[PDB]
Amino acid sequence: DSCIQFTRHASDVLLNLNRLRSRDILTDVVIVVSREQFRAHKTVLMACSGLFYSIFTDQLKCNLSVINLDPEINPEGFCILLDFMYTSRLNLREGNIMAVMATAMYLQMEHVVDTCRKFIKASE
Amino acid sequence: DSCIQFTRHASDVLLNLNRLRSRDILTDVVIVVSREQFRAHKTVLMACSGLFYSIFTDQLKCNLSVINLDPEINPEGFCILLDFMYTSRLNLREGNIMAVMATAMYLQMEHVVDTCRKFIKASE
Amino acid sequence: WVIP
Amino acid sequence: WVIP
Numbered sequence: 001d002s003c004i005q006f007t008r009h010a011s012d013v014l015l016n017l018n019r020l021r022s023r024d025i026l027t028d029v030v031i032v033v034s035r036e037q038f039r040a041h042k043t044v045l046m047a048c049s050g051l052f053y054s055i056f057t058d059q060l061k062c063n064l065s066v067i068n069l070d071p072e073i074n075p076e077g078f079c080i081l082l083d084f085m086y087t088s089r090l091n092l093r094e095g096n097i098m099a100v101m102a103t104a105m106y107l108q109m110e111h112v113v114d115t116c117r118k119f120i121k122a123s124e
Numbered sequence: 125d126s127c128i129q130f131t132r133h134a135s136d137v138l139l140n141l142n143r144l145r146s147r148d149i150l151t152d153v154v155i156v157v158s159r160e161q162f163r164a165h166k167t168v169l170m171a172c173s174g175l176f177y178s179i180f181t182d183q184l185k186c187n188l189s190v191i192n193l194d195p196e197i198n199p200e201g202f203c204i205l206l207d208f209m210y211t212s213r214l215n216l217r218e219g220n221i222m223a224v225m226a227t228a229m230y231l232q233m234e235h236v237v238d239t240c241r242k243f244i245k246a247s248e
Numbered sequence: 249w250v251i252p
Numbered sequence: 253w254v255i256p
């Protein structure tokens with residue numbers, strides 16, 4: 001086509017989706033990770049994670065308002081990844097890298113798994 | 125913070141949101157523009173438009189599944205802007221610029237209004 | 249705005 | 253990935 005493109009559009013959409021999340025506006029699911037609960041938008045979760053894409057395209061699970069993650073999943077690891085989904089920013093630290101990588105593998109977030117593997121290989 | 129950032133993340137999220145829209149997955153509103161209907165995600169509309177942000181933060185209108193736009197709004201103009209919201213790409217042409225600009229003013233999409241004004245000024 |  |  002002969003379209004023009006607004007460079008900052010995708011980033012501005014994501015910033016607003018994060019603002020809606022922070023204010024709990026039109027959030028439609030709560031992700032339970034052991035004792036912790038995280039409110040989010042199903043569409044953002046699906047757009048970022050192979051696991052959530054699978055879950056919310058399922059004819060029964062698409063209608064659930066609560067999703068319980070595997071008890072082995074670390075809440076901090078999930079929190080870091082949820083923040084990444086809504087911001088493009090990953091808070092990767094020596095103290096959380098193993099939990100972040102395990103959570104990204106479970107959530108099927110290939111680019112996160114890739115940078116975790118690379119940061120681990122550099123420290124060995 | 126000491127975060128790392130994935131450059132293509134925002135663009136990849138938007139591409140997936142557009143894929144969900146095309147497959148009518150978790151769309152939660154229909155925008156009626158005279159004889160035409162457009163299915164979309166309330167959160168994407170709010171993240172792109174001052175008008176939709178106002179509408180879906182309203183305590184009564186947030187729950188509506190159908191939103192009827194002003195009868196003066198051109199369906200093609202709306203279609204072009206809806207595509208822009210989900211892609212960052214604006215199909216701006218001599219034959220549609222007036223309708224696109226009028227629709228962007230109504231929807232409160234300042235960056236679109238700005239490029240329309242500039243393209244019009246260049247042709248006079 | 250750019251030509252993509 | 254970059255340093256933002």
Ligand SMILES: N#Cc1c(Cl)ncnc1Nc1ccc2c(c1)CC(=O)N2
Nearest residue numbers: 046047048049050108109110140143
């Ligand atoms: N929502 C949506 C969606 C759609 Cl519509 N099409 C294709 N992928 C989608 N999302 C999704 C699927 C697999 C993975 C990710 C996201 C990130 C990753 O590492 N794996």
Ligand SMILES: N#Cc1c(Cl)ncnc1Nc1ccc2c(c1)CC(=O)N2
Nearest residue numbers: 016019170171172173174232233234
């Ligand atoms: N959703 C959301 C949202 C939030 Cl949470 N905060 C601030 N603006 C939001 N969206 C919104 C408001 C005003 C305008 C636009 C988008 C584009 C434009 O030209 N005007």
Ligand SMILES: [Cl-]
Nearest residue numbers: 063064065066
């Ligand atoms: Cl439920």
Ligand SMILES: [Cl-]
Nearest residue numbers: 109110111112
């Ligand atoms: Cl990823």
Ligand SMILES: [Cl-]
Nearest residue numbers: 187188189190
């Ligand atoms: Cl309704």
Ligand SMILES: [Cl-]
Nearest residue numbers: 233234235236
């Ligand atoms: Cl805009």
